Amino acid sequence: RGTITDASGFDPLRDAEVLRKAMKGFGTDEQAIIDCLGSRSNKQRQQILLSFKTAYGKDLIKDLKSELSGNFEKTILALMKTPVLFDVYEIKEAIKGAGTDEACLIEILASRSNEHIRELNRAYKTEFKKTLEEAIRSDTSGHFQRLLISLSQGNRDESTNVDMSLVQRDVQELYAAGENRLGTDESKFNAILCSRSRAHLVAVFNEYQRMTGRDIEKSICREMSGDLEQGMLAVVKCLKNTPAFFAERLNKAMRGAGTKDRTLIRIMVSRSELDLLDIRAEYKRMYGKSLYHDITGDTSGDYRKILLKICGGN
Ligand SMILES: [Ca+2]
Ligand SMILES: [Ca+2]
Ligand SMILES: [Ca+2]
């Protein structure tokens, strides 16, 4: 379901030779870097990284970092991190400094699996002073902080069996926690949307629509505002259709005269080996133009080339 897969006939020491020749000497051969790194799975880029340092006793990442610049550099460095460590540094930068990149925290914590999130916690603690949870608490507050802490446990019910008796009970509780009352009990939404299984919550959304005649997402928009609202919707959307969710975030990152380059880079890189094919399909059905098309119009240069290389893949 991804666009980038293992390149066949693989030799990392040779790809390291390709990259050395592309950087050695005056000037830079940006096309050879893209043809190589962009056409290798992430695990293969790690072998290349180890072969590069073995052969020449230089740090590949350090050399690319000084050889390249701009958003083309950022895409390459993002490609060179492992899926877990790329997630780890994206969360760090989102919390870094003043302000918060809540959308990034939401995008990651709402889409990744239990197993992956458990690995984020270990990696975040290993790499940084704080734990993932302590990092969250510092930068978020209210019921939104609880939402991220809940998702950051990687403990969603992994069952696929649905009990309609409990589905209907969950629907009634959601109706009572928001739409059918003055005010909102955000905690009831949190516990149901974060702890219940995906097969269970999909049935809840369909049953909730049947009984109330309204989609759960509209109740959320009616009951909640701010980051808590965007968080809940992201969770529901990912439970429904994770590809369609990312396709929408991509579309919002490009529409306008400007571009959300951090988001654009993160999504293309982070989903390239998971479901970027499905994203592309969802993108075409929802907006008419292809994801490939909108990228060419919003980016340029080597930055666009590597992005499109990821879109097409292999
Ligand atoms: Ca050079
Ligand atoms: Ca209400
Ligand atoms: Ca609202």
Author numbering: 189 to 502
Sentences from the study reporting this entry:
The annexin (Anx) family of Ca2+-binding proteins is widely distributed in eukaryotes, with twelve Anxs found in vertebrates. The Anxs are structurally distinct from the EF-hand and C2-domain Ca2+-binding proteins. AnxA11 has the longest N-terminal domain of all Anxs, with ~200 residues. Recent studies have revealed that mutations in AnxA11 play an important role in the development of the neurodegenerative disease amyotrophic lateral sclerosis (ALS).
Since the long N terminus of AnxA11 renders recombinant production of the protein challenging, N-terminally truncated recombinant forms were generated, and the crystal structure of one form, Δ188AnxA11, was determined. Using Δ188AnxA11, we solved the crystal structure of the rat AnxA11 core domain. The asymmetric unit contains three molecules of AnxA11, and the structure presents the canonical Anx core fold. The Ca2+ binding sites are partially occupied, whereby two monomers have three Ca2+ ions bound, and one monomer has four. As is typical for the Anxs, all Ca2+ binding sites are on one face of the molecule, promoting calcium-dependent lipid membrane binding. We show that a 4-residue sequence motif in the N terminus of the core structure, conserved in most Anxs, functions as a Velcro-like bridging segment and is important for the thermal stability of the Anx core structure. The substantial difference in thermal stability induced by the four N-terminal residues of the Δ188AnxA11 construct implies an important structural element at this position. This segment, ~10 residues before the AnxA11 domain I helix A, is central in the folded structure, making interactions with the termini of several helices of the Anx fold, and effectively enabling a tight contact between the N terminus of domain I and the C terminus of domain IV. The 4-residue segment forms conserved interactions with the ends of helices in domain IV.
